[PDB]
From Swiss-Prot, chain A:
Similarity field: Belongs to the universal ribosomal protein uL30 family.
Keyword set, alphabetical order: Ribonucleoprotein, Ribosomal protein
GO cellular component: cytosolic large ribosomal subunit
A Pfam family this chain is assigned to: Ribosomal_L30
Cited Gene3D superfamilies: 1.10.15.30, Ribosomal protein L30, ferredoxin-like fold domain
GO-annotated molecular function: RNA binding; structural constituent of ribosome
Gene: rpl30
GO terms under biological process: maturation of LSU-rRNA from tricistronic rRNA transcript (SSU-rRNA, 5.8S rRNA, LSU-rRNA); translation
Subunit relationships: Part of the 50S ribosomal subunit.
Name of protein: Large ribosomal subunit protein uL30
Curated annotation (Swiss-Prot), chain C:
PANTHER family: 60S RIBOSOMAL PROTEIN L18, LARGE RIBOSOMAL SUBUNIT PROTEIN EL18
Keyword tRNA processing listed: no
MF (Gene Ontology): RNA binding; structural constituent of ribosome
Protein's UniProt keywords contain Nucleotide-binding: no
Known partners and oligomeric status: Part of the 50S ribosomal subunit.
Name of the protein this chain belongs to: Large ribosomal subunit protein eL18
Upper taxonomic lineage: Archaea, Methanobacteriati, Methanobacteriota, Thermococci, Thermococcales
UniProt record similarity statement: Belongs to the eukaryotic ribosomal protein eL18 family.
GO cellular component assignments: cytosolic large ribosomal subunit
PROSITE patterns the UniProt entry points to: RIBOSOMAL_L18E
Pfam families: Ribosomal_L18
Single GO BP term: translation
Sorted UniProt keywords: Ribonucleoprotein, Ribosomal protein
UniProt superkingdom: Archaea
Curated annotation (Swiss-Prot), chain D:
Species whose genome carries this gene: Thermococcus kodakarensis (strain ATCC BAA-918 / JCM 12380 / KOD1)
Protein name: Large ribosomal subunit protein uL15
InterPro entries, per the entry: Rbsml_uL15_N, Ribosomal_uL15, Ribosomal_uL15/eL18, Ribosomal_uL15/eL18_sf, Ribosomal_uL15_CS
PANTHER family linked to this entry: 60S RIBOSOMAL PROTEIN L27A, LARGE RIBOSOMAL SUBUNIT PROTEIN UL15
Biased composition (Gly residues): 29-38
Region of interest called Disordered, as start-end residue ranges on this chain: 1-43
Pfam family, one: Ribosomal_L27A
Biased composition (Basic residues): 1-28
Swiss-Prot record, chain E:
Keywords: Ribonucleoprotein, Ribosomal protein, RNA-binding, rRNA-binding
Designated name of the protein: Large ribosomal subunit protein uL4
Protein's gene: rpl4
Family: Belongs to the universal ribosomal protein uL4 family.
Domain of life, source organism: Archaea
Length: 154, 34, 120, 148, 255, 92, 124
RNA sequence: GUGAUCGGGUAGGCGGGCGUGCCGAUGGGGCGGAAGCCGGGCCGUGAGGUCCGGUGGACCCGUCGGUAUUGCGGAUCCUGCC
RNA sequence: CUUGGAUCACGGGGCAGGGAGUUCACCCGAGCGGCGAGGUUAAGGGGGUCAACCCCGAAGCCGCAGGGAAACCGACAGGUCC
């Protein structure tokens, strides 16, 4: 399973441990998204940065929209079905299906940038940055509901 | 016309016995290299 | 401190020529020698005849990116290319039946620089 | 060649010329004393620099002999003989006797023959003293030592 | 490089091969170093009176007068004195005659520079770029018989230069002579004068007198050559007339 | 990469045409010597076995460079004066 | 056209650009009659802290496009002219002549005549 | 060409530019009006430069290379004036 | 200056001119350049178109052999591997 992580809070007034962990996760700025695998070594880091990010399990339709809209190559170039059909024998939908069901890695697409840069959510965050999603806020683990947010921020 | 180098032997020979060695070296070099 | 290069326009021209030659022929030795010549003057290479005789063979070709000095013997004949020679070094290399030449003439005689030994 | 400009020209407008606070560049107190003041022996404001970088500066050790009696003997090596052979031949130092090449070092004005470096030619070395290593190298090159 | 030898009428007679000093590589850096050292070697030491500004007797008032703590004269006007921010006081860091102006240079570098400047005088593009008029010159380099060492009339030198083709550079030198800008006019040193050709000779037998008074023209022997004759202002490539004897003496001394 | 000839001089005592030109190169780097020879020969009807280029020079904040060329009448006259590094820099 | 576009950019930028003057130029006649920029260096200077409500400071971001930097608003670049030889050696397609202010009437008559018969724009 | 992973900054360290007076060279201007002064236009991030008009009545500038009593808002700073 | 300046903390009526990292000696480094197992002259001498220029002058200094309080003794110019 692939997890999506979005950064929500700034690193000012935060510990160097957290800052460095976020740098290692490549989450340098706010409203930036990264996709990783649900391994224990990643879950530990997510638990360490639990209070500055949201995360959850992502869906293939959402990933396809994400690649079609906010995906970039070296040079900040858009991704196109031309390029995908050339470098691989697939379309974006099939690539996403695979990626989320194993059998394929995003970096298998040559010159793919590993960070997605989103605008802030339409209608706004409907919960405080100072609290967690469970108790009515915004931070921490959602489930499939990370896709609603990715849609609002796409 | 030539420019023989003799200070190389002046700085080596024991003083009070330099002009004789210089003359012998002059003759030797003139012979060999000319 | 700002590290300038050489003030000898002939050295500057040689460095540019070496880089162009490397790009033309598809080799690395000329670019290597160029960056070695762009080395600060206080660290410029100096080699004596003894070292060449020690680490060469008969019929070898050698390039020195600095100066060659006269101290030691030469027991066999070799070709030496360098930017500056001393009188004694030139004389001692001619004796033993070798040849002392310039890096430009070496580039002429051998564009690929195959078989050449760098000493520094 | 390279004629850079002085950095006062750049610091003109800097208000302290790189010395810090406007209290920092004053008389001898700002150095800790004048000269080697405080390097030990009565005061210890620089005893730390003394023990890190300048030991054997305080105190005496040994004695000196008079130069009226000092003599500096002159020495030469086999490498030097072999590397200057042809000049020693051109000028006297090496000469000819029956079937032999001889090296008279007293002429040169040397008292000792030391033993650094190979010897190639065969020779007869005429001199007061010679070191055993030089003896062996000479007798291997095929010569003799005749001591005066 | 073979060259023709011309006569005082402007006609070639003989043929001679140039020595190897005319093949020396071009080194403007060394030429510049040597010219700058030569500059340094003719300047006079300058300093102020070491007791200037320190003739007044003063007394400071101190704390508690609504005034600053400055040393002041003790009669009627009571003006400040002796300090370097006072009017009429001493200067903080004046010029001093102890200062060293001399710059040293080594013989071998100096001679290499002279050789390079000679080789430069034997080049066309440098002579033209420097500013010399060479539209109607004969050879570049110009070599003339030893009969020129004996001409002691300025009008005969005029005619010879007309036939050789350097009178136009002499005219340029005359025309491009100006009255300076600045205070050097008070200290003499007015009439900044331009440079013309340089005649190198083996022996002087009248040519010095004959050619002296032509504006911009210098006459020098070979044994007494320097880099300021060959590269005025650090700029090499001066128009030079050589002689056969001078070139032979170059073949002998090479520098 | 365009070229405008600013000056032509003739020299009989040396036997050569001296050509001073300006190279307009905008949005492009300094042109190469082979290209400059090609264009000068295509324009002025010169023999490529002669025609050494001495220098191309660019300047601070500018898309115009300057160039100097010499066209000789004979190999004898060109070799008598021009040196070996200049003769090798070209395709000669 | 791109050159015209960059010209419009420069015009708008340099209309918006302020005239950069030192801390308090309005307050002392010693600064009113010699206006210039001096960087504020004080420990409590608000222009140094870049506070709101205060005049701004120069920076490298205010520069104009390289293509059009330094050109006369007409579109040409200027060349000072003191004599007719300098008048010659001008490309009448991209350069214009500006006659030096110390040149006399006798000589600028000639300069104008030659510019007229050469086709060179003269800004004076 | 690359820069999500370069664009705040005191003490402090480093790189490049603007300006002032003299020397060696080179190219120029000036009673058909130089320097300086007053008010204006244009270029330059800027340190500054240049042009227009007026006053003025004898010298002045650009480029290369060197030199220096070389750049002020403060010092209960110094002198003069108000 | 100060942890801290709009301060009831000090300096600050206006304008113009002046006004603050300089020189020598020794030492540690560097950016260039010359010669190179050698490098370099000082004082001074000769010539000249006479304070610029050219030619001499290696005395001395540093380096090529170090260890040792001293008497004293006195070494790889290349054997193997990465």
């Amino acid at each position: 399973a692939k997890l999506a992580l979005i950064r929500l809070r700034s690193g000012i007034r935060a510990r160097g441990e957290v800052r460095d962990t976020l740098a290692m996760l490549r989450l340098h700025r706010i409203n930036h998204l990264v996709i990783v695998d649900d391994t224990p070594s990643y879950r530990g880091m997510i638990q360490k940065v639990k209070d500055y990010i949201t995360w959850g399990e992502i869906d293939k339709e959402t990933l396809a929209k994400l690649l079609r809209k906010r995906g970039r190559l070296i040079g900040n170039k858009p991704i196109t079905d031309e390029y995908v059909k050339e470098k691989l024998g697939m379309t974006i939908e099939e690539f996403a299906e695979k990626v989320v069901n194993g059998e394929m890695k995003l970096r298998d697409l040559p010159n793919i940038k590993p960070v997605f840069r989103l605008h802030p959510p339409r209608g706004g965050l409907k919960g405080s940055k100072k609290r967690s999603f469970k108790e009515g806020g915004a931070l921490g683990y959602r489930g499939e509901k990370i896709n609603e947010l990715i849609e609002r921020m796409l | 016309a030539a420019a023989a180098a003799a200070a190389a032997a002046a700085a080596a020979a024991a003083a009070a016995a330099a002009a004789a060695a210089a003359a012998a070296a002059a003759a030797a070099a003139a012979a060999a290299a000319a | 401190v700002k590290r300038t290069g050489p003030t000898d326009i002939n050295l500057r021209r040689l460095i540019r020529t070496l880089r162009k030659k490397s790009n033309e022929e598809g080799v690395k030795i000329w670019k290597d020698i160029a960056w070695r010549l762009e080395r600060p003057r206080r660290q410029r290479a100096e080699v004596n005849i003894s070292k060449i005789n020690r680490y060469t063979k008969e019929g070898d070709v050698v390039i020195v990116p600095g100066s060659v000095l006269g101290a030691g013997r030469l027991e066999h004949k070799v070709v030496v290319a360098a930017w500056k020679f001393s009188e004694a070094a030139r004389r001692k290399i001619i004796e033993a039946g070798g040849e002392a030449i310039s890096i430009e003439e070496l580039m002429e005689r051998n564009p690929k620089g195959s078989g050449v030994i760098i000493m520094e | 060649m390279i004629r850079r400009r002085k950095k006062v020209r750049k610091l003109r407008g800097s208000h302290t010329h790189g010395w810090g606070c406007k209290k920092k560049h004053r008389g001898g107190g700002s150095k800790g004393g004048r000269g080697m003041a405080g390097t030990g022996k009565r005061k210890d404001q620089k005893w730390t620099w003394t023990i890190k970088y300048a030991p054997d500066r305080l105190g005496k050790r040994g004695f000196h002999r008079p130069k009226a009696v000092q003599y500096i003997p002159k020495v030469i090596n086999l490498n030097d003989i072999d590397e200057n052979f042809e000049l020693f031949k051109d000028a006297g130092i090496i000469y000819e006797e029956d079937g032999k090449l001889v090296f008279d070092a007293t002429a040169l004005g040397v008292d000792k023959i030391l033993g650094t470096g190979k010897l190639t030619r065969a020779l007869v070395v005429k001199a007061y003293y010679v070191t055993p290593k030089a003896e062996e190298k000479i007798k291997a090159a095929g010569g003799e030592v005749l001591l005066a | 490089m073979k060259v023709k030898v011309f006569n005082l009428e402007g006609e070639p007679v003989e043929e001679i091969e140039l020595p190897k000093v005319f093949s020396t590589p071009f080194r403007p850096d060394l030429i510049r170093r040597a010219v700058i050292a030569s500059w340094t070697h003719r300047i006079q030491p300058q300093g102020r009176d070491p007791q200037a500004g320190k003739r007044r007797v003063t007394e400071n008032i101190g704390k508690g007068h609504g005034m600053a703590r400055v040393e002041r004269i003790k009669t009627s006007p009571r003006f400040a004195a002796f300090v370097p921010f006072a009017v009429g006081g001493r200067r903080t860091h004046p010029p001093k005659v102890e200062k060293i102006i001399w710059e040293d240079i080594n013989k071998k570098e100096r001679r290499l520079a002279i050789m390079s400047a000679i080789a430069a005088t034997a080049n066309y593009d440098l002579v033209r770029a420097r500013g010399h008029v060479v539209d109607n010159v004969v050879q570049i380099p110009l070599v003339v018989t030893d009969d020129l060492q004996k001409v002691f009339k300025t009008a005969q030198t005029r005619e010879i230069f007309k036939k050789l083709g350097v009178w136009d550079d002499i005219e340029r030198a005359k025309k491009n002579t100006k009255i300076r800008a600045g205070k050097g006019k008070m200290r003499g040193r007015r009439y900044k004068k331009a440079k013309g050709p340089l005649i190198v000779v083996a022996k002087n037998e009248g040519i010095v007198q004959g050619a002296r008074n032509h504006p911009g023209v210098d006459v020098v022997t070979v044994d007494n050559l320097g880099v300021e004759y060959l590269a005025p202002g650090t700029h090499p490539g001066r128009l030079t007339i050589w002689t056969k004897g001078a070139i032979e003496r170059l073949r002998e001394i090479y520098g | 990469m365009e070229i405008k000839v600013t000056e032509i001089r003739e020299n009989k005592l040396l036997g050569r045409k001296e050509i001073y030109f300006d190279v307009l190169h905008e949005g492009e780097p300094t042109p190469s010597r082979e290209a400059v020879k090609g264009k000068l020969v295509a324009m002025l009807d010169l023999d490529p076995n002669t025609t050494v280029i001495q220098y191309i020079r660019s300047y601070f904040g500018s898309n115009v460079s300057k160039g100097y060329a010499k066209a000789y009448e004979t190999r004898e006259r060109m070799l008598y004066i021009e040196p070996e590094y200049i003769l090798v820099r070209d395709g000669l | 056209n791109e050159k015209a576009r960059l010209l419009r950019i420069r015009a708008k930028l340099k209309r918006k650009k302020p005239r950069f003057l030192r801390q308090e130029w309005w307050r002392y006649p010693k600064f009113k009659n010699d206006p210039k920029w001096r960087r504020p260096k004080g420990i409590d200077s608000k222009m140094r802290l870049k506070k709101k409500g205060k005049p701004r400071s120069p920076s490298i971001g205010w520069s104009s496009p390289k293509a059009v930097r330094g050109l006369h608003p007409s579109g040409y670049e200027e060349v000072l002219v003191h004599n007719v030889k300098e008048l010659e050696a001008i490309d009448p397609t991209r350069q214009a002549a500006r006659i030096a202010g110390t040149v006399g009437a006798r000589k600028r008559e000639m300069i104008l005549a030659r510019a007229k018969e050469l086709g060179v724009k003269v800004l004076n």
